[PDB]
Amino acid sequence: REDAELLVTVRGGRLRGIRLKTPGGPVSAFLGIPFAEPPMGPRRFLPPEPKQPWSGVVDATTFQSVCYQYVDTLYPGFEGTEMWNPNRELSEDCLYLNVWTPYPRPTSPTPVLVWIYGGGFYSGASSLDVYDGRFLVQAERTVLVSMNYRVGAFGFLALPGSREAPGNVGLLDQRLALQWVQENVAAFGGDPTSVTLFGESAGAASVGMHLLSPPSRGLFHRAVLQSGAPNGPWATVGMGEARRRATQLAHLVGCPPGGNDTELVACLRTRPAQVLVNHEWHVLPQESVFRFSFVPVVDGDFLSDTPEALINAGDFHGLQVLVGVVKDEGSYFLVYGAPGFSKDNESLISRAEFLAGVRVGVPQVSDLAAEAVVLHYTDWLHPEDPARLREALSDVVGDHNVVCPVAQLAGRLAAQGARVYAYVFEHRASTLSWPLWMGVPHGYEIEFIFGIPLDPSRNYTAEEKIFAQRLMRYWANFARTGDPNEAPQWPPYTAGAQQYVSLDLRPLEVRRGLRAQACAFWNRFLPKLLSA
Amino acid sequence: EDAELLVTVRGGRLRGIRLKTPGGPVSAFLGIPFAEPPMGPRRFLPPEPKQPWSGVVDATTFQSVCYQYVDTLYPGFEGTEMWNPNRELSEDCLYLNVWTPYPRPTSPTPVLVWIYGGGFYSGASSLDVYDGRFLVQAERTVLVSMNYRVGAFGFLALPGSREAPGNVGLLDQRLALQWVQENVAAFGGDPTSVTLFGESAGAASVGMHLLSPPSRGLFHRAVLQSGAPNGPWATVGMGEARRRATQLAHLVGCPPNDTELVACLRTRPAQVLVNHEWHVLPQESVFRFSFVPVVDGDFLSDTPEALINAGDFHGLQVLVGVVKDEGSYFLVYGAPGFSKDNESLISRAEFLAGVRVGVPQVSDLAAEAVVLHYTDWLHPEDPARLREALSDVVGDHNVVCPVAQLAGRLAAQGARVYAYVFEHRASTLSWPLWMGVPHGYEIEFIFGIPLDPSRNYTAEEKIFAQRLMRYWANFARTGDPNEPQWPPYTAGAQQYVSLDLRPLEVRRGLRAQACAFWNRFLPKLLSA
Lengths: 532, 528
Ligand SMILES: *[C@@H]1O[C@H](CO[C@@H]2O[C@@H](C)[C@@H](O)[C@@H](O)[C@@H]2O)[C@@H](O[C@@H]2O[C@H](CO)[C@@H](O)[C@H](O)[C@H]2NC(C)=O)[C@H](O)[C@H]1NC(C)=O
Ligand SMILES: *[C@@H]1O[C@H](CO[C@@H]2O[C@@H](C)[C@@H](O)[C@@H](O)[C@@H]2O)[C@@H](O[C@@H]2O[C@H](CO)[C@@H](O)[C@H](O)[C@H]2NC(C)=O)[C@H](O)[C@H]1NC(C)=O
Ligand SMILES: *[C@@H]1O[C@H](CO[C@@H]2O[C@@H](C)[C@@H](O)[C@@H](O)[C@@H]2O)[C@@H](O[C@@H]2O[C@H](CO)[C@@H](O)[C@H](O)[C@H]2NC(C)=O)[C@H](O)[C@H]1NC(C)=O
Ligand SMILES: *[C@@H]1O[C@H](CO)[C@@H](O)[C@H](O)[C@H]1NC(C)=O
Prior knowledge:
By secondary structure, chain A is α/β, with parallel strands linked by helices. Helices cover 33% and strands 16% of the residues of chain A. Chain A has a single domain, classed as Alpha/Beta hydrolase fold, catalytic domain (Rossmann fold).
């Protein structure tokens, strides 16, 4: 006595899933499918090995463990923090993926959406409530896949050139999952010839890196980059600085008691996973509000050059991408260490706090460059207005880290053969627990893309549910056709007209300029100065 | 004979002329010698006080114009010819002029001293737009103006040499100011109330007298119009001045010992030096200033910027301002694509080309920073926007931001500053409309030229001219232009007033965002 709809055979063996209820009807979920051998013991820091075939039926009936990661404790018990923290036990045995499909299974091959979570390459999990695929699959009849990938030291510690810790294995985790989709998604009714990757923040940077890595590029057809880009200043690190960071962590945990790499990694392997996590914060070169200790390394392998170079020199004919940002990208990060900031106050900073915030929000630039930032962002008719300083600091951090990297990628892709669509998400959710001064913070479009307002246990307003259904429709139209349009039209983004649309409760408004003036500073001038 | 027209000064007796204005007569003494003619062995040397004379000097007509290049870019065009010499060129040119009410005052009258502009290479006190008769009649002041040597004759420097020490044109101005102290009372002028006013290089001159202590005791108030001593074109270092002096010596067939070199230069006709003066500049530029004040530790003990930042300016009142479109006039003197006879709608390549020529000696890095700041990246190739942007580049770098930096430093360090922007386009203007209110075209209103019946200004423009004359003379009398009030300029509020036919409007910021680029960032970048 079984349900045939919940039984699927993949190349590795048989799976049994669970049937979820949604407001619109049932969907089939296969949660926690193993796609790699567990990377534990001698397998830690190594590239993932494909999951060996199994006999019997594996129950894919619940989310599996979260990969080991630092857990944020800035506002304990605060919904705005807790929603991003692991909702499963931490474990190095965490390489599992999730498939949601219509109930019953599609008769015709169905387009596939593949989600890559964010969290600065040091955190995140596919099991977070806000990444629940059931509403998207029910509303738009797609197949949705999400995977866990190793973060922090376990996914991106790199001793470049070494066999034992080559770096970027968290990206290879993603790639292995993408390879699993090509080989297996048709068993769930998905179309391996229509796969759209989507991600946010570090997930968006991951998506972009798969675009720029030929072995990944054959595994999908379309890409969505939400509030992140591979050319972001926090998303990559050079070979030498990666080695310095790996060596510093090893030194901090007593390894060895630099030297031979094989030996150093062997010492690192004897350390408890939690010990590495608790020391990862002490590795960074400068105090920062952003920077993350272990991120993808540009070592000539996964990425043959810097993403910026690969973007600038790329031929992108035959590609559709959808990119965008939230209205207030910088605000969320400032409450995480910038002087004068708190979610519990107005964070009306002084001029001196503004100056100190630029250094933390724009880490590792010269004084000369920091002076250029201050000049650019200061209103010299109101140089000391606290409210204006707070707003300017938010734009500094958001422009440098999210908006301008996105705009640069969008412009280069459009000019080099791809069709681009761009948005700014401008709705502040009625459920938002953050203060009003933060506006629409980083990450808070995700719940609308995934249709979370349709959850009966939540309290979104009726118009926000309509709004959520409109965005799910845009995303699914893009996955099926490469075009979010079906009514107000969404024009493509081009390097000249630079048109984008605003996403909020009102109909689409077409505007031009993704912070065009600001991003000319970050993308055209400051790069000149650096090499001088 | 008219007794009002005979004056004895320290050097002897003069005879002046009675002039007519629509408001009544005025006494004028034109072509008064204040120095020995700086000729032959005296060329390039500091001026010497005029030795006394017997008999009566005839002071009824303007004297010669000091030797200078004559602009030939639009021959016969009123816009260019109004600045060209209207008297014969001569090295025997150090004369000044005095206008007084008729009959001559018998109470000490405040004195205005005009220093003309012209990039330190040109200019004359005899130009029609500097006619002092209307200011003097309308506002009952004494007005003085002097000729000073320009070009090589006034500013060729072999620093350290006795023979060509540099800045002698500035010393010409100082001697005229010394002459005013010793003789102005004989005309009814008050030597304890002397206000200096100048435009462009004349304003830079005023600023340099403000920062040179031997000149500071010769006047009490200062007006700087479209110029500042910290302007990029206003000064030169000792090494570059020596290089320029040496290259002109080569160009006119003279040997590279300073004594030898200057002696050979002295044998060359004056016209010959003028004919080669442009060729000394290192790079091609819209500004032809080859010989300018030199920072040698003497007249200027430091750069004007260093002197400005360090000075105690309590007790000083100053009036500064700009025209609405400072850059447009300079663009037609060689910026690619520009002409008075077209709309000057330039390409982006021409805009970029024009930046290098309007900002003459900056690195590519700095130039790039300029084109980043002045590009609208939503309309990067719009010809009309590019034309206006390059006008802003040239005007901000050369006039507006040097003036704004001076005004802010002086206010923050004790001076009472009043700032204006002159926004009225003269109904008689011969330049095209796209130029707006160009550099130099506030002068005619402040000298009351619209009151001349033989000119075609409107009734409204004459009322306006009378307003400006009252502001300027109020400031000369009291250090305050007011009688809608004109508030002082401050480093914080940055308030200025708009001068046009409308009543005064108070605004904040002399291109504050643009000038933060020139006055705060770029200096940091150049050193690195
Ligand atoms: C760097 O060191 C590694 C490991 O050293 C070995 O580890 C010991 C436990 C034992 O295996 C010993 O042989 C060594 O001390 C080297 O890898 C070994 O290289 C030697 C041959 O030269 C030999 O042991 C095996 O080939 C390797 N054993 C492994 C992989 O554990 C490696 O060659 C050294 N590289 C250099 C030169 O820096
Ligand atoms: C606004 O608040 C921030 C943060 O204060 C936090 O929230 C408060 C309600 C309270 O719980 C504090 O303990 C929290 O730190 C202020 O920034 C801090 O100010 C304190 C003052 O003693 C200082 O000791 C800390 O170092 C500051 N932390 C920083 C700069 O990150 C800020 O000063 C407040 N601004 C105002 C006046 O509104
Ligand atoms: C607008 O006019 C400028 C300048 O043209 C000048 O005025 C004309 C009436 C005529 O007298 C020309 O000889 C003058 O040069 C133009 O710029 C020039 O364009 C010509 C080609 O037509 C070129 O050979 C010159 O080198 C250019 N000179 C400069 C200083 O750039 C400009 O092309 C005109 N633009 C228009 C009318 O759209
Ligand atoms: C939604 O609001 C209701 C109001 O009673 C509350 O009981 C419930 O806990 C809320 N659930 C949320 C905020 O998810």
